[PDB]
Write an enzyme that holds these catalytic residues in place. Sequence first.
Site, PDB file in Angstrom:
ATOM      1  N   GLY A  34       0.826  -1.192   0.055  1.00  0.00           N
ATOM      2  CA  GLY A  34       0.017  -0.041   0.008  1.00  0.00           C
ATOM      3  C   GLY A  34       0.868   1.316   0.196  1.00  0.00           C
ATOM      4  O   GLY A  34       1.945   1.232  -0.115  1.00  0.00           O
ATOM      5  N   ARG A  40      -6.991  12.235   5.541  1.00  0.00           N
ATOM      6  CA  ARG A  40      -7.507  11.119   5.937  1.00  0.00           C
ATOM      7  C   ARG A  40      -8.241  10.278   4.852  1.00  0.00           C
ATOM      8  O   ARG A  40      -7.978   9.292   4.780  1.00  0.00           O
ATOM      9  CB  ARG A  40      -8.042  11.138   7.407  1.00  0.00           C
ATOM     10  CG  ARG A  40      -8.404   9.700   8.042  1.00  0.00           C
ATOM     11  CD  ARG A  40      -9.358  10.018   9.358  1.00  0.00           C
ATOM     12  NE  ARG A  40      -8.733  10.744  10.307  1.00  0.00           N
ATOM     13  CZ  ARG A  40      -9.247  10.912  11.478  1.00  0.00           C
ATOM     14  NH1 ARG A  40     -10.663  10.727  11.722  1.00  0.00           N
ATOM     15  NH2 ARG A  40      -8.401  11.673  12.451  1.00  0.00           N
ATOM     16  N   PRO A  84      -4.985   2.311   6.645  1.00  0.00           N
ATOM     17  CA  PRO A  84      -5.633   1.953   7.632  1.00  0.00           C
ATOM     18  C   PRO A  84      -6.247   0.706   7.929  1.00  0.00           C
ATOM     19  O   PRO A  84      -7.105   0.245   7.252  1.00  0.00           O
ATOM     20  CB  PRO A  84      -6.913   3.299   7.538  1.00  0.00           C
ATOM     21  CG  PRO A  84      -6.940   3.338   6.283  1.00  0.00           C
ATOM     22  CD  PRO A  84      -5.744   3.068   5.622  1.00  0.00           C
ATOM     23  N   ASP A 135       0.245  -1.413  19.425  1.00  0.00           N
ATOM     24  CA  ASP A 135       0.039  -0.486  20.479  1.00  0.00           C
ATOM     25  C   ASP A 135       0.088  -1.048  21.729  1.00  0.00           C
ATOM     26  O   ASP A 135       0.676  -0.647  22.749  1.00  0.00           O
ATOM     27  CB  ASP A 135      -1.201   0.429  20.143  1.00  0.00           C
ATOM     28  CG  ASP A 135      -1.165   1.311  18.899  1.00  0.00           C
ATOM     29  OD1 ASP A 135      -0.146   2.128  18.699  1.00  0.00           O
ATOM     30  OD2 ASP A 135      -1.875   1.077  17.857  1.00  0.00           O
ATOM     31  N   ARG A 171       3.590  -1.764  22.682  1.00  0.00           N
ATOM     32  CA  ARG A 171       4.466  -0.533  23.139  1.00  0.00           C
ATOM     33  C   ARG A 171       4.161  -0.016  24.436  1.00  0.00           C
ATOM     34  O   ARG A 171       4.957   0.482  25.107  1.00  0.00           O
ATOM     35  CB  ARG A 171       3.911   0.523  22.056  1.00  0.00           C
ATOM     36  CG  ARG A 171       4.534   0.378  20.759  1.00  0.00           C
ATOM     37  CD  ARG A 171       3.911   1.495  19.873  1.00  0.00           C
ATOM     38  NE  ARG A 171       4.721   1.635  18.441  1.00  0.00           N
ATOM     39  CZ  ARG A 171       4.388   1.978  17.164  1.00  0.00           C
ATOM     40  NH1 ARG A 171       2.921   2.203  16.991  1.00  0.00           N
ATOM     41  NH2 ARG A 171       5.192   2.124  16.383  1.00  0.00           N
ATOM     42  N   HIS A 208      -7.114   1.555  15.395  1.00  0.00           N
ATOM     43  CA  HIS A 208      -5.845   1.913  15.489  1.00  0.00           C
ATOM     44  C   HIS A 208      -5.434   3.375  14.787  1.00  0.00           C
ATOM     45  O   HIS A 208      -5.850   3.788  13.656  1.00  0.00           O
ATOM     46  CB  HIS A 208      -5.139   0.674  14.421  1.00  0.00           C
ATOM     47  CG  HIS A 208      -3.407   0.942  14.520  1.00  0.00           C
ATOM     48  ND1 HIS A 208      -2.627   1.169  15.447  1.00  0.00           N
ATOM     49  CD2 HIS A 208      -2.824   1.076  13.298  1.00  0.00           C
ATOM     50  CE1 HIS A 208      -1.610   1.276  14.878  1.00  0.00           C
ATOM     51  NE2 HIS A 208      -1.521   1.384  13.828  1.00  0.00           N
TER      52      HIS A 208
END
Lengths: 312, 312, 312, 312
Positions: free
Chosen positions: B80, B89, B122, B149, B152, B176
């Site tokens: 992508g 966006r 996305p 996430d 992290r 996300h």
Amino acid sequence: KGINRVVLVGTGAVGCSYAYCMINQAVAEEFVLVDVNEAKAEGEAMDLSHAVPFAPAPTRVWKGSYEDCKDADLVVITAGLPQKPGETRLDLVEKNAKIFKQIVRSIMDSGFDGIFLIATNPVDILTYVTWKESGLPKERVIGSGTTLDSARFRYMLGEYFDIGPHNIHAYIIGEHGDTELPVWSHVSVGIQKLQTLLEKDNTYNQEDLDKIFINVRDAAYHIIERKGATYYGIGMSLLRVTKAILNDENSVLTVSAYLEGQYGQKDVYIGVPAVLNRGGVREILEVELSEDEELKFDHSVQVLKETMAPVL
Amino acid sequence: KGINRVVLVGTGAVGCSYAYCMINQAVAEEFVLVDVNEAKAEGEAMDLSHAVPFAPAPTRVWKGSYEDCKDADLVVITAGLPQKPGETRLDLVEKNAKIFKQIVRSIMDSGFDGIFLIATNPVDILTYVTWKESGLPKERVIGSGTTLDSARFRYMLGEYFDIGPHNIHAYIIGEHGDTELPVWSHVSVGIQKLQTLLEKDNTYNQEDLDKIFINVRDAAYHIIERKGATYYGIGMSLLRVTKAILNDENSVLTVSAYLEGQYGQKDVYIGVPAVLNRGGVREILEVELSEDEELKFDHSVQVLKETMAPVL
Amino acid sequence: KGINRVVLVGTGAVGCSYAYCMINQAVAEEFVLVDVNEAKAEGEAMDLSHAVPFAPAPTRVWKGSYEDCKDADLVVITAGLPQKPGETRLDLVEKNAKIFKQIVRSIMDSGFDGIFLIATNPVDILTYVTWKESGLPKERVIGSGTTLDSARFRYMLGEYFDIGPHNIHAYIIGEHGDTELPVWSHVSVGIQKLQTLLEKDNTYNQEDLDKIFINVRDAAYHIIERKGATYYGIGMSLLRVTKAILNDENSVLTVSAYLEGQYGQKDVYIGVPAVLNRGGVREILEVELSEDEELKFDHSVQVLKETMAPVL
Amino acid sequence: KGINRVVLVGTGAVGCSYAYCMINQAVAEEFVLVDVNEAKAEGEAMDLSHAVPFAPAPTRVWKGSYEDCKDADLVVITAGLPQKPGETRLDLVEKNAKIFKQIVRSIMDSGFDGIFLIATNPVDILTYVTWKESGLPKERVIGSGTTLDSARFRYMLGEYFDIGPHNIHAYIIGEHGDTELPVWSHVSVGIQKLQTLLEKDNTYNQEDLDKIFINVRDAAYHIIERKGATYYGIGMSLLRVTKAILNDENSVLTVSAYLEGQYGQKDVYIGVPAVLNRGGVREILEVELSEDEELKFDHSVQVLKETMAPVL
């Protein structure tokens, strides 16, 4: 202490690929990133850190400085400049030797007292520069040598014979990136001797194998043409050498080691089979080269001496 | 027959980081690289192959094409385009949705009948698009969602509390991106419940932790600014998800899964706690969200539905 | 399916040691224990189960029955009776062949259609009995052969040469437990040829090596004298063979394989170098034995034929 | 220097199971076996050594003696005698305390200055005895405590909830044996809190879980009755603890640790959640026990103190 700290100096694709292998396999308790571009080292350290919770076991990864070398067990140097067109290998030597003198000096200034593992091109020569500048014993200054070439050799021999590369016993020696040579006389495919496979009535012949060696030699070039750089291979090679040292393996790898009469040659670092353990290079193994291989090896030592001139 | 084949579509830093983890950990017997830039895929396949001889066990790695998906068990899409300076966006959603539509069509054309793992931003949306275009069961189309996430988050909490991130149980859910939320009410450090830790007499307090979540949420920006991109973290989280599926683990990961009533919400792929095994998403787990968490999850779902309008 | 199930038949110290290796290394998704002593199988399954939460990754371990063989990929048989004093190897054959006929019949009755791995003494002969009774292809019926002896050989050669056993290339072939032979002509210590090491001016000589082979041959006896039984070695050997099959490795092991003209011999299972993958024995490798080794190998085949008589 | 040496004292099924895990996972470079029955230790050392060539990486394994503890990093004691028909709880304490006293004296005599890991029943008490006799800091004397029971608990909960035991966060604390308690209030299945799961509309309910705890508590009896002894579970939990220490993990395990005020309790070694790293027990974690849990922990501590009277 009671644990292993690795400091990586140079945080480009090569150093970071090695770091990622080290995280995937949880080899060192501590892994420190150092580079002249601190922001790059910070970003890398962050990105690699975030892989750790999903790795098999933890590693403490951080961006540090030369000070962190004081208590390090192993310093891996991948920093340096690539060869430009309009430059010769001798120019590459000059400019990386100069960089190396600053890097090594700063490292020793921290109080470092471990082992050097050098990956930067030209690797045998920069190992030598590192030994001269550090004042450490020759055993404790090591270069990746032809470990990567031997891996490529095994992989391609694997494809050719239809055998997993873990069952191929094949080595490349000499100067990585200039005068490397295949040790045909000590190649096993599984248990089979290479000679035996060639003599039988099949499709395996020396001409095919000679093409394979050329494909090994030119591999970096073919990869660079396609993806801009090479790093995944060297990364795993450095992983492999690191395990041999930190896990005290007494295993045999074709690293850059300092010759003292082996193969009738002396006073250079070059890629040769050596036994590695926690003390570094425990010894150099002297195989019985065929006369052709011995000729090629002598040639490789001589060319190396000439290329090293700017640092002698 | 009786082995696992993974096909990677998109051979950028993210895909190749994932491949490198897969080679380091010898997860699948066969690993195939597919990209529109055939030369890049070749060069990556070469470089990755050369790591295999020094890996724990063999993987067969090669540059193939869509037809190699016919007998693939898992197709991982990292192909992508990143959001370029100038684009909104919705521009990113539109352009990547158009690209994915064509890629997913091509893969289905091969006869592929396995599981999709989607990693491209996305992710929740592109996971939805993959499901729509492929016609496969919703449990067999999966996105990496908030796994990274969560990773992290565990890492930074680990730092804050001086505990190995493998002992921290902390999850992020939702879309996300900037509408994701930390499930504070279900966090535990070691065995210790977060509430317990915050009420005791120590330096620990909720506000430090709010700051940490924000650092987690926006972490990609800080990394990209420093080192140009993010790939190591996501590589490992894709590895992790692949292990859950291929090794039939019945483990819990916050992947993108299709809601049908859970959390009082439906008809989107979004990051939620799910049980993963060889069949894909076995089920979605419905935790008891606190009031705030519930509001935040609601908000996240509806923002997602509004972002989705050009595909629906 | 899409996963590997191993069924172990025989839950003594050998089977259970193998099972523990399999749990430690998370090689199969499913691992089923079957024995005539069901209570022993249940206790073992419980004890092994409780190791899983601390293993690297999960394995589903349970005590089952022959029915569970229907969907199994690999059945490992360690069940049988040990040789009594007052018995000869031929009596051992008779009584274990009889047990094997019942075991194998019940297995095939379940609908089993995978691969057999036989560990019970006498292993080459019982592999043969298993092939005859199962009616499966010769490739899919495999015995541990001399894999363990080769491991012992490498370990002891390792000690003698001061090199990690992972760098020793050394094999034992022939009938495990009676007429095994060392393949001196294809032994490498690191890269070094055995011949080369012997010819140099050092302390390495053939007499020392011949003592080592005898110590390999009598190793079971020395271990049994000291601890009552042997199991840790065979357990890891079976682990190793299992990986080669289930992970489709194309690696070379000296398993029991059915000869069809290789080494000028036919119509027996015996320990020889073979390539293993997901289909079982892909092929037998024919090395160029020295005339001495060829004599020993011929001798081993002849003695094996005589010992096999009660099942011919 | 720069490597890890583990000395195992007691070469029974438990010690050797642990050694076998250590070899399977290549955790320490050197692993030494010491037992009063020297012949048993030799034979075990041999059998274990022969597994090493097929293991992931080398371990040096040998039968030594107390003097090999001088430079040991970790001494693991599994030596002792099981409770024989006829003997009371106090008989077992007395006899094993007398034995441990002599073993610990002998080890200290060697110059040993590392960490003790104690596995012999009664573990909390024998851990206390080791501390008293050795004079080492309390953080460097450690028992396996309730690690195994926590593991068993996670496994059975895993079965009950259909979730991989690696995703379950459940701990047992107190004295290892019939006064231990499940910390119900801090159990989570996946991310989901136990309370949440019990209040939802499903087959899950607290009473099934009470039955499971009892099965966990008494599991050793059921195993011993079936297969004669228990060793595989404990082997792996000793492995686990060793990894936390040797790999400096800062992980949380319910080992036997010396209380000085935590849980309103003091002056015993007992199973509690602790952070482990290279220095041993870094700290003990104080969870918020429910009312019942607190009462149960109190009860466990005082029963322990009363059992302890012959050593105090």
